[PDB]
Write a protein that binds this DNA or RNA. Structure first.
Length: 194
DNA sequence: ATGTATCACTGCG
DNA sequence: TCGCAGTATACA
């Protein structure tokens, strides 16, 4: 959390680092796999180009009561905060100064689970606050495209910080990587509005 | 109403 | 194995 690779271009502003060492990350990830309860059924379908699909991964959301989060036809309410999530949130707040009330958690069982190209833009995502993507497990390729391409390997225990207006000009994705066979759990902390 | 973007898929090179 | 091309409802 002292060594940052800054990513900057017209409309792009992100920062990356390895926040947790190997041991602390293994301990956390081992806790996450036990505690996190992933959504199922209706709560795991999105609507895109006219059709519903199951997401090719698992999703959960946690955060303060009453906040919601919508994208692609689906509204999610947060389950309440569990210690391991509290612990990751607060250590992230500690290095960034920033503060968060909500966390989307995506789990990729292996390298065929993915997330398609999108922007993480939306009204309820508050002004003046970034998005913090933390990762545990397998290492997976993360790509920015400007509708030019920056490819970023997200390592075990890393933190990708995503400031304004990265989200109002560039698309991101976690493409299929067939050669990866291990799980990845990603956490993206946000500061949402009522 | 009526305009606009698409957090997903398959096909194929 | 990867990634470009071409894709009927929301929700605005």
């Amino acid at each position: 959390s002292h060594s940052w690779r800054h990513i900057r271009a017209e409309g792009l502003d992100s920062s990356y680092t390895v926040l947790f060492g190997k041991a602390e990350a293994d301990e956390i990830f081992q806790e996450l796999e036990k505690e996190v309860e992933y959504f199922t059924g209706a709560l795991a379908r999105v609507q895109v180009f006219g059709k519903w699909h199951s997401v090719p991964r698992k999703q959960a959301t946690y955060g303060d009561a009453g906040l919601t989060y919508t994208f692609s036809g689906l509204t999610l309410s947060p389950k309440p905060w569990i210690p391991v999530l509290e612990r990751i949130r607060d250590h992230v707040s500690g290095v960034t100064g920033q503060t968060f009330n909500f966390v989307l958690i995506n789990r990729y069982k292996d390298g065929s689970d993915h997330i398609c190209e999108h922007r993480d833009d939306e009204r309820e995502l508050a002004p003046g606050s970034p998005i913090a993507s933390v990762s545990f497990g397998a290492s997976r390729d993360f790509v920015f495209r400007h509708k030019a391409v920056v490819r970023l390997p997200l390592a075990h225990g890393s933190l990708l910080m995503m400031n304004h207006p990265t989200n109002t000009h560039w698309y991101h994705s976690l493409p299929v990587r067939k050669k990866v066979l291990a799980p990845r759990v990603n956490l993206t902390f946000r500061k949402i509005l009522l």
